[PDB]
């Protein structure tokens, strides 16, 4: 039950790490096996360690200690570490900022941590990122989460958000994928230095390899 999403996430992590898909597969599967987590979560851990600038062992150690410290899930600890690595701050500072933003926007801590990460990814203030994202939310009728993903995809593509949404909706129409999946395909192709068709072709080959 290896999904196209899972294959696309692997391709993305191969690009982030600057290694082959074969190497990223192996590295992700070793870590999934070692920790008994999902493939998606193993890919997320590889991404967090890249962002932290630590080894994977070290990132896992930090995440497990932070789970116990705050009583949160592994996923939440990883998101806190990620938001802190993107901010260049301590986890305590990251969570402090998330809590202030949580109260301001009336969103969850997890949503606030994602916003902080996204603003850092865009090189903008949070206020700017939230303004842009909320414009999209209202204009397109997408979630705040979806709007943030659109901002990030557009940046990877080197285009406006209008361009990114135009392409994503074409992929939805043509291939019957969700907007989320269309955005992921777009992002992966940009990260790999390929066309959308070639990214999807690769993903399918990889999905099968792991069948």
Author numbering: 23 to 233
Cite, word for word, the article reporting this structure.
Here we address these limitations by introducing an artificial metathase—an artificial metalloenzyme designed for ring-closing metathesis—for whole-cell biocatalysis.
To further improve the affinity and ensure near quantitative binding at low micromolar concentrations of dnTRP_18, we set out to increase the hydrophobicity around the Ru1 binding site. A comparison of apo and Ru1·dnTRP_R0-ΔHis X-ray structures with computational models reveals an overall agreement with the toroidal shape but notable deviations with regards to the shape of the inner cavity, as well as the position the Ru1 cofactor. The Cα root mean square deviation values between the AF2 predicted models and the X-ray structures range from 1.59 to 1.63 Å.
